[PDB]
């Protein structure tokens, strides 16, 4: 950006800032402000329908900066269904100021993450919150009676996992209560309060929580807490994940990881 400063000083400057965007899925859109698409470092940035709003919010993070960048929705670059899916949610966009006059000088104006997303019939508004804002969300590190093991296999949990987890294919598409096949009766009720990551389909390992796993005819009907993101077709592969109630007793019955038990029950 030093040469970019020089370009401004000379006055021979053409703005080609490219708002490269990496979504939660990891797909990348160059989105350059310049009307002629520029490949900077091998990355074409789309001239078409690139959100402008270049100044937006520009503090140094003392104030978390949400760069409001309402942009014309480009179906090709951005999909409404994906926005609804949330693939676009939590998308980190690195705004690099580049010059058409010189591709070599790229200085990142800011690192931003879309935090607030809004939609319109043909256009959309995005608030590009800075990393401090996400960092500033409070976790609280609560310590309490129930196992805080939570998701199994985490570094704190040190869960062996392994054999209990099983993979199944959906036999019937019932939205939240889809019936699946390839799951044993024993497997059911161990996947209760678990997840059903869908290898098959758009989810690609994204799983709605299984509120209830109940054995039925033709495999286990799985009642998810919520309807699956994307319409899940029957026959889509899913990896059922063992669900622990994370009660000290439940943790003990299922795995008995005394060394790693995060449930401090008595007082």
């Amino acid at each position: 950006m030093t040469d970019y400063t020089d370009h401004l000083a000379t006055g021979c400057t053409t703005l080609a800032r490219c708002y490269i965007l990496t979504r939660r899925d990891g797909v990348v859109m160059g989105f350059t402000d310049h009307d002629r698409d520029i490949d900077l470092d091998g990355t074409r940035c789309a001239a078409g329908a690139a959100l402008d709003a270049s100044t937006a919010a520009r503090s140094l993070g003392i104030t978390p900066d949400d760069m409001d960048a309402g942009g014309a929705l480009s179906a090709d670059a951005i999909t409404e269904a994906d926005l609804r899916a949330g693939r676009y949610d939590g998308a980190q966009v690195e705004v690099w100021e580049v010059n058409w006059t010189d591709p070599a000088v790229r200085g990142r104006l800011g690192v931003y993450t879309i935090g607030q997303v809004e939609r319109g019939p043909l256009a959309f508004r995005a608030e590009l919150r800075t990393r401090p804002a996400l960092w500033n969300r409070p976790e609280g590190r609560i310590h309490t009676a129930l196992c805080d093991v939570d998701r199994l296999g985490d570094h704190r949990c040190k869960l062996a996992l392994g054999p209990w987890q099983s993979a199944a294919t959906v036999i019937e598409a019932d939205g939240a209560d889809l019936i699946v096949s390839g799951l044993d009766e024993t497997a059911s009720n161990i996947f209760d309060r678990g997840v059903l990551d869908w290898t098959g389909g758009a989810n690609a390992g994204t799983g709605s929580d299984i509120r209830v796993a109940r054995p039925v005819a033709g495999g286990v009907r799985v009642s998810l807490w919520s309807a699956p993101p994307f319409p899940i077709t029957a026959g889509d592969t899913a990896n059922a994940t063992v669900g622990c109630d994370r009660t000290a007793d439940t943790c003990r019955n299922r795995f008995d990881n005394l060394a790693n038990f995060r449930g401090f029950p008595l007082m």
């Binding site: 009307d35 001239a47 078409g48 329908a49 690139a50 402008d52 014309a72 480009s74 019939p121 043909l122």
Partner: protein
């Protein structure tokens, strides 16, 4: 709906404005990027009337007529000179001039449709075919009886559906539906009596061709 059919006098129509109203544009970024929004069912027309009134008595008649609908109740029948001729102002409209469509052996009903443009024509169904200008034609011969024309509908129904391969061609004058844009009407009448005046051009009467939702 049923609507109302009330004729707008042709002489008053002689003194009337014509402006084409079209929608569906809403383009995108001004980086040379264009997106075509689709409003749907557009191509209405805009008119300003009262320039054809001629005299005080006639002016009274249109005013009374506006009062009759009490503010555009339902539909209003407007004679559109431009759409009246399916052919040309100097050329007689014929059944053959406008092509309704082709019967498939099950196509009993054909709405009168005005096709405007060629490669990607927009077709406008006509709510009211002017009576007596409606002629039905078939590829073999001009078609006479057995076609049931719904004057409010604009649909002509062959009792026996035309078989595949016969072109239905119908050309008729267009009595277009209109809804007045503004309730307020300016009155220019010129006081009569000793002055004995009267005015030929009442101003500011605004009407919009209305594509009625059926």
């Amino acid at each position: 709906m049923q609507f109302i059919d009330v004729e707008f006098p042709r002489d008053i129509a002689a003194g009337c404005q014509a402006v084409l109203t079209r929608r569906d544009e809403v383009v995108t970024l001004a980086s040379g990027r264009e997106e075509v929004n689709s409003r749907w069912a557009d191509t209405r027309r805009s008119w300003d009337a009262g320039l054809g009134v001629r005299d005080e008595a006639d002016l009274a008649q249109v005013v009374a007529l506006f009062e009759e609908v009490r503010g555009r109740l339902y539909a209003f029948r407007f004679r559109d000179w431009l759409d009246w001729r399916t052919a040309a102002t100097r050329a007689p409209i014929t059944a053959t001039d406008q092509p309704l469509g082709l019967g498939d052996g099950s196509r009993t009903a054909f709405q009168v449709v005005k096709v405007y443009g060629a490669v990607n024509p927009y077709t406008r169904p006509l709510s009211l075919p002017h009576p007596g200008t409606v002629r039905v034609a078939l590829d073999g011969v001009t078609q006479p009886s057995g076609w049931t024309l719904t004057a409010p509908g604009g649909v002509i129904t062959f009792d026996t559906p035309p078989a595949l391969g016969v072109t239905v061609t119908a050309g008729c004058s267009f009595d277009v539906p209109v809804r007045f844009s503004d309730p307020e009407l300016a009155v220019q009448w010129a006081y009569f009596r000793e002055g004995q005046a009267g005015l030929a051009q009442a101003p500011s009467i605004p009407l919009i061709e209305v594509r009625l939702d059926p």
